[PDB]
């Protein structure tokens, strides 16, 4: 049996891992594919818990299509968007 | 006798301390006065070593007068500007 809080904690951690790996360089890899997918699917960019990556996140164009640098700098936190998914709010 | 590298290391650390204290809240205090002075005097904002503060730095309007959010997000790193002062480059 999978608990709401434990599953939400892991998706956030899985995300943090992906984002940490994605900002390392400009190399096309799965982490970028995964980060670009989470961002598009949830309409978010980066996390509050990983603020040290925001500039790097922008530098690698990892935020969704359509929105500018200011919109992406102030985009919705992915950890919150993950919480809303597992709690059914959106 | 004061060594170039040790003095440059301390000004940067003194700065880091000030910036850490300045972003804590919106309270007018010396740390903000000190951070606003360093930023204006050296024409810089935040540090590369303290990227986790950039958004907070913007949130508190701690970057110099005249420049927008994009200019301030991509403003010159204060640790580098401190290095240029102690080495006589500018």
């Amino acid at each position, epitope marked *: 049996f999978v608990n709401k809080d434990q599953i939400a904690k892991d998706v956030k951690q899985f995300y943090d891992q992906a984002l940490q790996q994605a900002v390392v*360089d*400009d*190399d*096309a*890899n799965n982490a*970028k*594919a995964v980060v*670009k997918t989470f961002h598009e699917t949830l309409d978010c960019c980066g996390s509050s818990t990983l603020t040290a990556l925001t*500039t*790097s996140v*922008l*530098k*690698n*164009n990892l935020c969704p*299509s*359509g929105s*500018n*640098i200011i919109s992406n700098l102030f985009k919705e936190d992915c950890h919150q968007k993950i919480d809303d998914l597992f709690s059914g709010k959106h | 006798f004061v060594n170039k590298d040790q003095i440059a290391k301390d000004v940067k650390q003194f700065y880091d301390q000030a910036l850490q204290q300045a972003v804590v809240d919106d309270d007018a205090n010396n740390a903000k006065a000190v951070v606003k002075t360093f930023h204006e005097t050296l024409d810089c904002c935040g540090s*590369s070593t303290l990227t986790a503060l950039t958004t907070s730095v913007l949130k508190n309007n701690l970057c110099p007068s005249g420049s927008n959010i994009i200019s301030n*997000l*991509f403003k*010159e*790193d204060c640790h580098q500007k401190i290095d*240029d002062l102690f080495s006589g*480059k500018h």
Partner: single-chain antibody
Amino acid sequence: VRLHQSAAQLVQPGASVRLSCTTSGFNFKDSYLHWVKQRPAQGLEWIGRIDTGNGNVKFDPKFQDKATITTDIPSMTAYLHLSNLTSEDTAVYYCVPYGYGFHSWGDGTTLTVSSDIQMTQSPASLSVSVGETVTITCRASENIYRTLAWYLQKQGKSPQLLVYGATTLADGVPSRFSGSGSGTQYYLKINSLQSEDFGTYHCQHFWGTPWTFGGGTKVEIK
């Protein structure tokens, strides 16, 4: 008021040169500066790139030992050092900043020496009349995650950025231009084609390294 590029250089085989690129208005300090080679009467070729963040440099295997990239951060300048020069180095060298969005290229530096994701652009040639609606297509060998750009190149001039991302119109570009597409297939539609938009259309992906270009689409009046 972005990229500033260094002047022309005429040289003989065996020489060594330095082409330069100065930014202004960009976070040069923690960015990616790429160099793109354009051989006369031939396509766009990616040379290499510097990450000014860590100082890492990457090159297309062919330019591995000859080419070199260095930076001058306070002056916000990028240098491409080329050694053992030959006739196949006679080309235009464009400087391309990348990272906090998508940018227009430098005007280019002409060097004259005299003595992996595959892109599929379609059609190759297009014979149309003013007011007609045209649809150019670009297909990637893999999902490029909408990190594509459409450019318009007019004879002897630097490629003009039309659409970045898949759908975003670059500032100052007329509304009549429309980018669309996803995953592996992308399109550029030109609504009510005009005289000032004739030439070669290029697509490009920015999903990792090396950067690759479409064959080109030549639009002309009959």
